[PDB]
Amino acid sequence: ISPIFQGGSYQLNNKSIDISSLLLDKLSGESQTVVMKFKADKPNSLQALFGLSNSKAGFKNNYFSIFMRDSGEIGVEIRDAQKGINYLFSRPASLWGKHKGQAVENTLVFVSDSKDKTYTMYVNGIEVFSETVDTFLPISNINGIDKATLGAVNREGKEHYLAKGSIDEISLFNKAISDQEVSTIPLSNPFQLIFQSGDSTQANYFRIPTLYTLSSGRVLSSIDARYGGTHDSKSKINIATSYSDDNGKTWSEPIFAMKFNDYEEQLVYWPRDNKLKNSQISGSASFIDSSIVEDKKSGKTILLADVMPAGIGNNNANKADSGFKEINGHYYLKLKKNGDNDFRYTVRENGVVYNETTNKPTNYTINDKYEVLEGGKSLTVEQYSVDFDSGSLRERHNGKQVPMNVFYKDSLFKVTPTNYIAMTTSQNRGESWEQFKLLPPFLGEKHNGTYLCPGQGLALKSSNRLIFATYTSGELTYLISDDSGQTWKKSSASIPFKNATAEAQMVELRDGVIRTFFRTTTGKIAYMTSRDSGETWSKVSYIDGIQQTSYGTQVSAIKYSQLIDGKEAVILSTPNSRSGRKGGQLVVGLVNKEDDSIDWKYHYDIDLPSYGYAYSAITELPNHHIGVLFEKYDSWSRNELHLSNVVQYIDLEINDLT
Numbered sequence: 001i002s003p004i005f006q007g008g009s010y011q012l013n014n015k016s017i018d019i020s021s022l023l024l025d026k027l028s029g030e031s032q033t034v035v036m037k038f039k040a041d042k043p044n045s046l047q048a049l050f051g052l053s054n055s056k057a058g059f060k061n062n063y064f065s066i067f068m069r070d071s072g073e074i075g076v077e078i079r080d081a082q083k084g085i086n087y088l089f090s091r092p093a094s095l096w097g098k099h100k101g102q103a104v105e106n107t108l109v110f111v112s113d114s115k116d117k118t119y120t121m122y123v124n125g126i127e128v129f130s131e132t133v134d135t136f137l138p139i140s141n142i143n144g145i146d147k148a149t150l151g152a153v154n155r156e157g158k159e160h161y162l163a164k165g166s167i168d169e170i171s172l173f174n175k176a177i178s179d180q181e182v183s184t185i186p187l188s189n190p191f192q193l194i195f196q197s198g199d200s201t202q203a204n205y206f207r208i209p210t211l212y213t214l215s216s217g218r219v220l221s222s223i224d225a226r227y228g229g230t231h232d233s234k235s236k237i238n239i240a241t242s243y244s245d246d247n248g249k250t251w252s253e254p255i256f257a258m259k260f261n262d263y264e265e266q267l268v269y270w271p272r273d274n275k276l277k278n279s280q281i282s283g284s285a286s287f288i289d290s291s292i293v294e295d296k297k298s299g300k301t302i303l304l305a306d307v308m309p310a311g312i313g314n315n316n317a318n319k320a321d322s323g324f325k326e327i328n329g330h331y332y333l334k335l336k337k338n339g340d341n342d343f344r345y346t347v348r349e350n351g352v353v354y355n356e357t358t359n360k361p362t363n364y365t366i367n368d369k370y371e372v373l374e375g376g377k378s379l380t381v382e383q384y385s386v387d388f389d390s391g392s393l394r395e396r397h398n399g400k401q402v403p404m405n406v407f408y409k410d411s412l413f414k415v416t417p418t419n420y421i422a423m424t425t426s427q428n429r430g431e432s433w434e435q436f437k438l439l440p441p442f443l444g445e446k447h448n449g450t451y452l453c454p455g456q457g458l459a460l461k462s463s464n465r466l467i468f469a470t471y472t473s474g475e476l477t478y479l480i481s482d483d484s485g486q487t488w489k490k491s492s493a494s495i496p497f498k499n500a501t502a503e504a505q506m507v508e509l510r511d512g513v514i515r516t517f518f519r520t521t522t523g524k525i526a527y528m529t530s531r532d533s534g535e536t537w538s539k540v541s542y543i544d545g546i547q548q549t550s551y552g553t554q555v556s557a558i559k560y561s562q563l564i565d566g567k568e569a570v571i572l573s574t575p576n577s578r579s580g581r582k583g584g585q586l587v588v589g590l591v592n593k594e595d596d597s598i599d600w601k602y603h604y605d606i607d608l609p610s611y612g613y614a615y616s617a618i619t620e621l622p623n624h625h626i627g628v629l630f631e632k633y634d635s636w637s638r639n640e641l642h643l644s645n646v647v648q649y650i651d652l653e654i655n656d657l658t
């Protein structure tokens with residue numbers, strides 16, 4: 001159907017615009033849709049874009065509004081004091097402000113559906129909330145409504161929630177348009193989605209993006225596909241990948257690089273209320289924090305990620321146990337059998353499960369997928385599914401049998417409850433992945449594994465050397481391979497931090513010279529340098545001119561292929577803020593070839609200083625553009641948990657940055 005009202009080119013300059021005459025007598029029936037294309041690149045702290053109110057004395061709480069905050073939050077209020085209704089629905093981190101320094105046209109669609117008693121908001125083609133109520137309040141059924149307003153709400157004759165921005169286009173319909181019809185509304189998005197709710201992963205949430213440009217020109221991305229809300233492990237999380245063959249313009253349907261099947265892959269709307277938002281899938285194995293590198297010699301792609309057995313994360317991982325036993329100068333994975341109080345088994349050569357108490361081998365073996373076989377026969381466990389049907393999280397058997405894996409809660413044989421690092425490879429540039437293998441311990445039997453630094457590994461340009469950074473208490477632990485990742489050694493680099501999440505990413509400044517940039521607890525990004533391809537490392541220095549919070553955020557970095565202002569250039573991606581994960585920037589640094597110091601010369605604002613920006617991935621695309629895949633929200637804030645479609649991708653050119 002066509003609109004009952006349509007208007008545009010409204011400038012909101014801290015002065016409301018009255019459209020009562022045009023709109024109020026057009027409103028009819030109990031269902032409505034608002035479609036609004038608007039810009040706000042310098043919003044007030046809290047502002048209303050659109051309002052329908054009773055402006056009379058004594059009815060200040062009788063109004064409908066669409067409002068936004070300078071945090072990027074969008075929402076509505078639907079209020080009628082006589083009816084005793086005060087609805088407030090909203091979602092943080094739903095908006096764009098600026099892109100390439102120009103104000104972004106956001107497309108907002110609000111559907112008020114009396115038949116289904118549901119209010120649904122979309123912004124930029126993304127559903128940010130859908131709320132069903134027992135007692136529906138039609139937006140123009142508010143008692144005594146007498147004003148329709150742009151850029152404020154008229155309460156008792158005065159302008160509340162005054163806005164700064166513009167509404168280029170606004171249409172209203174006397175119908176609740178379908179989700180199908182919404183999908184046909186043209187958008188002006190500055191961004192793309194690679195991974196998204198409803199795709200092949202069936203994860204409703206994503207975190208920890210990576211990007212890496214392959215020698216063929218294919219661009220590969222990996223990510224945490226997070227099922228139980230956006231929580232770090234313990235949860236259910238798989239590692240998923242997607243690639244682009246056209247410089248980032250389009251992306252393949254995701255596949256899994258690493259996955260467990262003890263729990264179903266379920267698209268769940270995780271509760272965001274204060275009572276339930278910390279609900280956590282507590283019995284599932286999971287992966288977390290992936291990193292990618294390409295090996296020139298073999299041509300293989302290599303992906304590592306942390307691995308957690310059922311119920312396990314950072315919080316509860318057995319520190320002081322690697323989960324391996326040394327026997328002869330070799331490391332074997334330890335196992336505990338159903339009913340034992342200790343770990344009396346090891347996985348020796350050829351997956352053979354071996355009893356340590358009696359040095360006797362068993363009739364159990366572990367196959368390549370870490371699955372348990374008895375006498376060559378595949379053992380199984382029943383899968384779990386999760387739901388909130390009861391008002392709290394339940395994890396229960398779903399009737400389906402899956403291969404028994406030693407990382408599972410229901411397995412006859414279990415690994416040590418600690419964190420491991422797994423490796424997989426692809427021989428077809430991400431079209432499929434091999435079954436993962438655990439990496440051996442690097443810091444000894446009685447040390448839990450290090451934590452992988454998410455993002456990219458480093459393939460030195462002049463050799464076959466591959467490096468993945470990892471971190472642990474007191475050091476960075478670089479993992480080095482010269483044989484296509486068949487064998488690894490460590491190179492330890494002391495840092496003056498205990499228990500830091502020292503997520504580190506590397507650039508090769510020139511042949512053999514590596515600078516690593518890393519997250520700290522000091523509010524500054526740190527760096528160190530190797531001049532011998534990672535064998536030894538300098539002391540730690542800090543970057544001035546960029547601020548992070550006390551807790552820090554992952555930083556991504558690349559060495560750009562082209563000179564800028566006649567100099568070798570490095571580009572860093574990070575929030576720039578001492579307050580929260582917001583104020584995203586790409587910072588272009590020029591290398592002083594006299595001493596390899598870096599002059600951080602250009603700061604490019606990804607979006608508003610107040611809009612969210614957390615973990616990120618950057619890559620130089622084959623056409624010399626820059627691709628950025630990043631968490632567009634504050635992934636620390638306890639107010640912005642469990643948001644869908646906030647990991648987003650943009651394309652930039654160097655002239656945009658400088």
Ligand SMILES: Cc1cc(CNCCS(=O)(=O)O)ccc1F
Nearest residue numbers: 232233234288306313314451635
């Ligand atoms: C549970 C767990 C957590 C980490 C660290 N992730 C930190 C993410 S954030 O800084 O809190 O957003 C790394 C590995 C792991 F298994």
